[PDB]
Design an enzyme around this catalytic site. Sequence first.
Site, mmCIF file in Angstrom:
data_model
loop_
_atom_site.group_PDB
_atom_site.id
_atom_site.type_symbol
_atom_site.label_atom_id
_atom_site.label_comp_id
_atom_site.label_asym_id
_atom_site.label_seq_id
_atom_site.Cartn_x
_atom_site.Cartn_y
_atom_site.Cartn_z
ATOM 1 N N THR A 291 7.363 1.962 0.021
ATOM 2 C CA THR A 291 7.405 0.671 0.704
ATOM 3 C C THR A 291 8.345 -0.273 -0.034
ATOM 4 O O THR A 291 8.341 -0.324 -1.267
ATOM 5 C CB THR A 291 5.980 0.050 0.781
ATOM 6 O OG1 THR A 291 5.115 0.940 1.487
ATOM 7 C CG2 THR A 291 5.968 -1.299 1.489
ATOM 8 N N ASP B 59 8.330 0.420 5.554
ATOM 9 C CA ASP B 59 8.192 1.749 4.975
ATOM 10 C C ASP B 59 9.506 2.525 5.007
ATOM 11 O O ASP B 59 10.326 2.357 5.915
ATOM 12 C CB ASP B 59 7.103 2.528 5.709
ATOM 13 C CG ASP B 59 5.704 2.020 5.396
ATOM 14 O OD1 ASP B 59 5.528 1.291 4.391
ATOM 15 O OD2 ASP B 59 4.773 2.343 6.165
ATOM 16 N N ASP C 30 0.832 -1.195 0.000
ATOM 17 C CA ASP C 30 0.000 0.000 0.000
ATOM 18 C C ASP C 30 0.874 1.256 0.000
ATOM 19 O O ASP C 30 1.610 1.527 0.957
ATOM 20 C CB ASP C 30 -0.955 0.010 1.194
ATOM 21 C CG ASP C 30 -1.920 1.182 1.162
ATOM 22 O OD1 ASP C 30 -2.067 1.813 0.091
ATOM 23 O OD2 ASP C 30 -2.547 1.473 2.208
ATOM 24 N N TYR D 166 4.984 9.025 5.150
ATOM 25 C CA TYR D 166 5.109 7.918 4.201
ATOM 26 C C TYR D 166 5.714 8.368 2.876
ATOM 27 O O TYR D 166 5.219 9.314 2.265
ATOM 28 C CB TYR D 166 3.757 7.261 3.929
ATOM 29 C CG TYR D 166 3.891 6.146 2.929
ATOM 30 C CD1 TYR D 166 4.282 4.874 3.339
ATOM 31 C CD2 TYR D 166 3.673 6.367 1.570
ATOM 32 C CE1 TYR D 166 4.435 3.845 2.427
ATOM 33 C CE2 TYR D 166 3.827 5.341 0.647
ATOM 34 C CZ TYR D 166 4.205 4.084 1.089
ATOM 35 O OH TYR D 166 4.364 3.058 0.196
ATOM 36 N N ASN E 103 -2.874 -2.927 6.139
ATOM 37 C CA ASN E 103 -1.976 -2.077 5.334
ATOM 38 C C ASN E 103 -2.370 -0.618 5.080
ATOM 39 O O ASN E 103 -1.710 0.068 4.304
ATOM 40 C CB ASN E 103 -1.520 -2.782 4.033
ATOM 41 C CG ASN E 103 -2.588 -2.795 2.939
ATOM 42 O OD1 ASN E 103 -3.544 -2.025 2.958
ATOM 43 N ND2 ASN E 103 -2.404 -3.670 1.965
ATOM 44 N N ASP E 104 -3.426 -0.143 5.741
ATOM 45 C CA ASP E 104 -3.741 1.285 5.745
ATOM 46 C C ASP E 104 -2.817 2.027 6.699
ATOM 47 O O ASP E 104 -2.614 3.243 6.561
ATOM 48 C CB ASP E 104 -5.180 1.540 6.176
ATOM 49 C CG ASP E 104 -6.186 0.992 5.200
ATOM 50 O OD1 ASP E 104 -5.922 1.070 3.984
ATOM 51 O OD2 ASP E 104 -7.243 0.474 5.649
ATOM 52 N N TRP F 203 4.190 -4.613 8.168
ATOM 53 C CA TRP F 203 3.001 -5.434 8.040
ATOM 54 C C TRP F 203 3.491 -6.582 7.225
ATOM 55 O O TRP F 203 4.505 -6.514 6.597
ATOM 56 C CB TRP F 203 1.692 -4.772 7.608
ATOM 57 C CG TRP F 203 1.695 -4.346 6.179
ATOM 58 C CD1 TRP F 203 1.185 -5.005 5.112
ATOM 59 C CD2 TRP F 203 2.242 -3.205 5.669
ATOM 60 N NE1 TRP F 203 1.420 -4.301 4.025
ATOM 61 C CE2 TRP F 203 2.062 -3.201 4.337
ATOM 62 C CE3 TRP F 203 2.901 -2.202 6.319
ATOM 63 C CZ2 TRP F 203 2.533 -2.158 3.605
ATOM 64 C CZ3 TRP F 203 3.374 -1.139 5.598
ATOM 65 C CH2 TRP F 203 3.210 -1.121 4.221
ATOM 66 N N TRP G 220 3.252 2.277 8.812
ATOM 67 C CA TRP G 220 4.211 1.511 9.587
ATOM 68 C C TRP G 220 5.592 2.153 9.539
ATOM 69 O O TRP G 220 6.540 1.562 9.016
ATOM 70 C CB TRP G 220 4.275 0.068 9.073
ATOM 71 C CG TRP G 220 2.995 -0.714 9.262
ATOM 72 C CD1 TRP G 220 2.116 -1.103 8.288
ATOM 73 C CD2 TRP G 220 2.458 -1.201 10.497
ATOM 74 N NE1 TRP G 220 1.077 -1.818 8.836
ATOM 75 C CE2 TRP G 220 1.262 -1.893 10.190
ATOM 76 C CE3 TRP G 220 2.875 -1.132 11.831
ATOM 77 C CZ2 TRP G 220 0.472 -2.496 11.169
ATOM 78 C CZ3 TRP G 220 2.086 -1.747 12.809
ATOM 79 C CH2 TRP G 220 0.896 -2.414 12.468
#
Lengths: 376, 376, 354, 355, 125, 125
Positions: free
Chosen positions: E116, E70, E26, E113, E98-99, E51, E102
């Site tokens: 990933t 991330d 995500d 963010y 995954n929202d 995750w 992390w």
Amino acid sequence: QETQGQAAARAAAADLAAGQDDEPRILEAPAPDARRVYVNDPAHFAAVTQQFVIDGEAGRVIGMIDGGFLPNPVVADDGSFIAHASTVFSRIARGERTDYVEVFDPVTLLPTADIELPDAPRFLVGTYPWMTSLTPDGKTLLFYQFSPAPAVGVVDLEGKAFKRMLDVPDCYHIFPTAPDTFFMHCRDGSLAKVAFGTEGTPEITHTEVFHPEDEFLINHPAYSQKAGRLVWPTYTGKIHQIDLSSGDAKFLPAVEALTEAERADGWRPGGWQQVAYHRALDRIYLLVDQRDEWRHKTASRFVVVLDAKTGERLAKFEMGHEIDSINVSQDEKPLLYALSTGDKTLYIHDAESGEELRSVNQLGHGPQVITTADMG
Amino acid sequence: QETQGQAAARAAAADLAAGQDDEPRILEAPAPDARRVYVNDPAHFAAVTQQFVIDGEAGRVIGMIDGGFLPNPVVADDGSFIAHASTVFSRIARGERTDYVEVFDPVTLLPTADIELPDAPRFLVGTYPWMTSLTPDGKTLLFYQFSPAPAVGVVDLEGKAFKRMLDVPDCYHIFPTAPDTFFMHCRDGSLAKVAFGTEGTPEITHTEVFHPEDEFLINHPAYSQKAGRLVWPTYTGKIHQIDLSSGDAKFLPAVEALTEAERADGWRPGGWQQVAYHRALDRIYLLVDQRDEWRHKTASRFVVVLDAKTGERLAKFEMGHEIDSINVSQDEKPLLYALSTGDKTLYIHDAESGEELRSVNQLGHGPQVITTADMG
Amino acid sequence: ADDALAALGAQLFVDPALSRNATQSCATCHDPARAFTDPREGKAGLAVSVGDDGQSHGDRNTPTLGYAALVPAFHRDANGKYKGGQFWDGRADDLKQQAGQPMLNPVEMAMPDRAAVAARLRDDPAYRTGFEALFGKGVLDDPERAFDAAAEALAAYQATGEFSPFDSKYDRVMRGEEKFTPLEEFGYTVFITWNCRLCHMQRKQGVAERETFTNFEYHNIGLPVNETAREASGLGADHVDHGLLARPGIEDPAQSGRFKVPSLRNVAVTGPYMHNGVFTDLRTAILFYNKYTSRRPEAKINPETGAPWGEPEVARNLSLAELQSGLMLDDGRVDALVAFLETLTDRRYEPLLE
Amino acid sequence: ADDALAALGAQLFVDPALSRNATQSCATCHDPARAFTDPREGKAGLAVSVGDDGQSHGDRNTPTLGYAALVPAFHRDANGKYKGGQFWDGRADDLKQQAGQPMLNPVEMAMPDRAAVAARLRDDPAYRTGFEALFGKGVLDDPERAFDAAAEALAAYQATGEFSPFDSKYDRVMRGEEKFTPLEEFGYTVFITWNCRLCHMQRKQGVAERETFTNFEYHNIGLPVNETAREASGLGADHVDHGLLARPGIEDPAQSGRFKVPSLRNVAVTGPYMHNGVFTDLRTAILFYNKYTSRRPEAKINPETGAPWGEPEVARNLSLAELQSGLMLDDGRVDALVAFLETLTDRRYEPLLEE
Amino acid sequence: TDPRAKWVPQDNDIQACDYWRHCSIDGNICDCSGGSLTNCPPGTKLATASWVASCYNPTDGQSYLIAYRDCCGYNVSGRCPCLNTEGELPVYRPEFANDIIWCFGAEDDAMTYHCTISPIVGKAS
Amino acid sequence: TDPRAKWVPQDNDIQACDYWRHCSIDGNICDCSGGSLTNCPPGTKLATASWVASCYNPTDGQSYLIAYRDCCGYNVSGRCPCLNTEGELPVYRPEFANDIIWCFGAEDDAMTYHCTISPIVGKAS
Ligand code: HEC
Ligand code: HEC
Ligand code: HEC
Ligand code: HEC
Ligand SMILES: [Ca+2]
Ligand SMILES: [Ca+2]
Ligand code: NA
Ligand code: NA
Ligand code: NA
Ligand code: NA
């Protein structure tokens, strides 16, 4: 058929022709009403974001609010104010983090409170409406914390000050029922009642487990604070309804949004805000489509409408677009709002016939969250 | 023909098969070289922005840099560092303004300096490369202030401190020629040479007027600091060349980028960074197309290449895209860079044949500024 | 021959004639019935082991020999991180260099020298046969060769499938032979997504062929002194266990207080825990890591004592980047971790789980 | 009727018989040769005007009468902004209510009362014929009717083309009869892009039919006391000119220090400038606005004196929103604005532009 | 392109959203902004949190645990955006959710963010 | 729609980029984010500074001076983006230059660009 832009061109031509003067000034948004709709753009995790304040009846942007990184918007049901919990950094996306709450006047859009949240306590996540929540009296804002552990922050909006963090169990989401009470959904399958006096450890009571470990409840349930109705769909479109009006949780009969035959045909809810609830009509609205079981976050082209009491389907609409989120106005003959993240467009439908009435495009980079005030 | 994404899939597959281990970590950008290219995205006036660091030879994004509101990028010609002057606000686009300069390590992309600029002194404008400029030694950054009056800010990069503002005449742009000296273009049609100290009124000397008031010199002239060559197109593709290599302004013969017949048929320069200059080759590159006289900010689909000495056209490339900005690498067999604000794509061409070689897409929202280092 | 060499080490391993007063063998402190650890209760409980003299205690917990054979020889990798070797501080290069050391340790088996060891081997007709067949005639008459040969047999023995069977529930689940329980799968998932896997996995990425739940690195996780064990050790209250800095040749002050990441195989049956056996319970060992993440008052409290954990023995070189993960383990996740770690128990030690 | 009323006003306007000692007419302080301003030197230069007694000085500079007829009657619009009226403080509603006041002002024309004015009108055979033809028989016998009629006549006269010809170069340019010089055009562009347009244009937006370069509003731009003028007036060192707050009926303390925005027409020839004639030069009036925008030391210095502009007479209710533009006027733009303002000179006063 | 259709993994292009390791990714693929499959771009900070998903590899028929980490402290890259949800569970099962951003454990407490990475940390089960 | 074609003013829709008053607009039409043709949206701040253009009105054949004013203190609206440059001159003639963020004089020293209004200030000459 005359568009807002055309009518405005004629009025401006008439003014010029009649020699009518007018002072360039800052507009006020029209008074909040039932048909006002807010669309939040989390902007696919961009460091800064936008909220769009929209007149649903005209299909017009009447204002905007800037936010930071994945803010949580809230809208007081009585229309008296709006707010969000937001997050900024001293160098765009790097440096010192400041988490804070802003309250805004809903006609000037001016910030009337800016309340700093100590120790950067916000849960940073794809926007879930119920990760931040107003108490029914509107004097308290509650926000969720994930790190280091599940926790709930108490923000006094009346005194414009942060109060404290509440230790909670392994639970998620915040559904306020009173000035001093909110419910959460817990990993173990129960709901947690959290009663917080002005001082001390909160009193936490669990209900009995209401769903099995293999039954997945979505991130975007619908909650009507005024009805005390929690409408929680699962990945299969099975719908949990919990009445919280008495101050305690009472589990209503479970209802299926799709038929067994549709489920076998691959019909599954999918999107972001997959469920809306109309309070007066006691009516549940759900984004469904045919899809693989792990395409649960994709857009849906259909909405089904069912009686909350009996679970009979009342209608099924072909939305005509890739829709991610839905919501409804809480007035009579309500509007059905259908937001496309991909198209960046709010589509405004008549909730009774499901017919498209108008649309507002250009709503950011990836708009996802629709909020309406319940004013009746 | 194998894409970078396919090659990587192949290598990752061989690693998994071979049982090869690697540590997840923060990469370094490859060493700054002649074919490094920077693309800045002013994002159509968004509050926050991005710079893309690109390997022009591979057509690969090798790094990024976040910026605030309409920052000014500079790149040290020797490759030792990059920097920008940037602007942030305490609440996204509202509240307290902080203007500051950052210097970055060109391989880690880490900030090595963060220098606050007192009293918010930056000129906020659609990005012009020569509104912020490095001295040849790279010890000083100079930035333009417009409000309350034309001024030039002096930033000591070595000492990592702001020094002073300089009062200048009604002039624009900053072209450094020495540790303590730069040139500006003045409203009266002259250039101003500004020779400055740590304190004291600077020694400001006007050259002769070199153009009429009805010739319009574009906001994006090309300037080669190592050659001391200022290449300044007008709206019609007439090009003024000023030689500053002696330390004083010497006016070169003007050249016409377009023929008389082309001009009669509507050919004009147009875009953002409309001109590039190759130092070793002494060549001028100009973005041109068929257009109305007041469509001078629109994209162009053609680049003309001409000898700076004789004005003789060496080529006319059909770019095959809507191109707003050009620039060239400064090595032998240079690349012609062609940036499309509409496509958000940097197109990389062989500057000799004009042939498109590769492209880098998804470069923000409205990328406009290309910068390369002259390392030879 | 490689079978015979191991067979010789099998003999030596349970032989008390390799101790001064003939009261203890390797098997005394590395009890094959307790995953090659020490079941005997001493002045400091099971934290430290008693030597051949019946009085002397060590300052460190006796570790398992299971899977020690999978540890690479001591070295410094390209990243500058020391890896491998033997002992909690890696002062031995490998199993061979380690094997002879307990024999001559006065607080352990307590033989005065290699000569004394050779004399004891020479007294056994089966050793004269066994050693000479493998190493040549007159090996036992040379103290240096006899000692080195004994070390090689023990190392060889430690390298047999018996010390590293890979028949734990984890191993069976990874061969698709059975499934984790709900609680075990949660435990495993937590283990590989939380900070645990940063040190307790062989590789940073990819799949290990023979996982032993250690990266072989050295880390200071900021453990306190074990009061009674330090007392029993007789090293004095002034003494500081500097971990890896104690290895001869290691001079780098950044290694002070660092210890080898133990393998978590058989962890459920090899308490007490850590280099100084300070924690009797597995759950305590897990909960210790919460002291760097949780903000709850209870995270500061050792549940075994009801008092604060205590200051680090060595306050510097703490692995803070790894330890300060930003996330607290709740009781459900601790339960899950215990459950997962219990699956790292070898088949033959499964009855020990109750 | 329209012609005759005005023609009667023309006679009264130049008649010194409306002053106590008969030394002074409207035309004395409002001289048609100087865009209806006072060319006479007093104890405070040309800042304030000397009355009929030859000794009394006013405290305010004598404004032009040119284009005054375009100003709306005094009122408060829905914005809460007061607009229009006459006098620097708009204490008179309109031209008619204004006209009689200088006649009765002891520091000016100094007639004791309306009866004494009626008496002087009664003495002139031409007035007996003129007044009675317009207002009826026995008008000059009624002090109240006669004073009011004289006011009426004077107001009507000031409303003629004579006072508002709209024949300045600016007007001719707007008709397309000629073009601005590059300097004037620059000045015009500056004037309509800078803060000037916020107060010195009739309208907020759109185009005015009869532009006179004022929005008729009330603003405190923060001017100092004119010391020699204030001394000459004799009002006292402790006296404060409250501007609009002085109008009877206005009690709002936020109106203190606010004055009517003057029409900029004929500004180049009606020096000295501001309500107290504090500045001699047009350039100086322009540069004053730089005190709110420039950071340079020179910006807070009055170039005519070499000393600071001075502490504001009323240091409250300043139009800071409009004044603090964030942009300083460089000398080139000041030159440009001078040049533009000069195009606001009526044609008959163009020869005055050299001096 | 049929977004609702069952996801089809490939092993030929890491920059495409149907690459097998991205089965519950995500945000953005770090390889498109100066990182690589399993490394962060310069200037960003690598989270220690993750995750997890079991992603089927069509090449060798084996299912691997991808622990997504991330790269943080930068504004979202805006290059190669992707959202897949193979075995992705709601927030109350955070290990599979995954929202969530992390970014925990990242240096300098970086929490924004950017992108990933998709490293294998084991075989499934 | 041909970007290089001569600009063609209309007087029938203010949200379109060809609306006559927008002849030298740079940015966004305020009418599309809660303002109007000549008013700023709530929460923003009206600049006092302006840039000018002579824009031809096809309704009455007159050329009018449009003194554009920015509404400031908000991130760019992102709605009805337009860039026109009729008569637009380079920065050294700033009164005709439209790249400059003309936010000077705005309340609270707001200097971020949100959108632009298009009021008439006079007739052309
Ligand atoms: C007195 C009890 C005692 C006896 C007898 C004993 N050990 Fe140990 N063993 C220990 C202690 C204590 C340590 C840890 C010491 C240290 O780390 O400094 C240890 C460490 C080891 C290690 C290192 C394991 C690791 O993970 O680092 C090996 C291998 C080993 N012993 C094998 C042997 C062999 C072979 C013998 C027989 C010669 C033996 N031991 C006899 C108590 C004993
Ligand atoms: C910074 C690297 C690192 C991290 C992260 C880490 N460990 Fe450890 N672990 C160690 C080291 C080093 C030791 C030995 C410490 C000592 O005795 O000095 C250890 C000891 C242990 C022990 C005792 C085993 C024995 O034989 O004594 C257990 C159980 C354990 N760790 C489990 C965990 C769990 C569960 C997590 C995740 C919550 C975790 N660890 C996180 C490095 C780490
Ligand atoms: C002694 C010199 C003097 C004489 C004589 C005089 N005035 Fe004035 N006039 C002034 C002064 C001084 C002011 C401004 C005073 C104030 O604002 O309080 C003024 C203001 C005015 C105004 C208001 C103008 C504006 O823009 O606000 C009008 C109209 C006017 N005079 C007309 C007349 C008429 C008609 C007469 C003859 C009855 C006359 N004046 C006689 C000096 C004089
Ligand atoms: C805040 C509204 C406002 C703004 C903005 C403004 N003015 Fe004025 N102007 C006034 C007022 C009010 C007066 C009378 C002041 C007084 O005497 O009290 C005045 C007086 C003048 C005078 C003297 C005229 C006379 O008859 O005495 C000149 C010249 C002038 N202004 C020019 C300008 C120029 C040029 C600008 C643009 C730089 C400008 N003004 C900006 C309101 C304004
Ligand atoms: Ca142990
Ligand atoms: Ca005057
Ligand atoms: Na102890
Ligand atoms: Na050492
Ligand atoms: Na004076
Ligand atoms: Na009063």
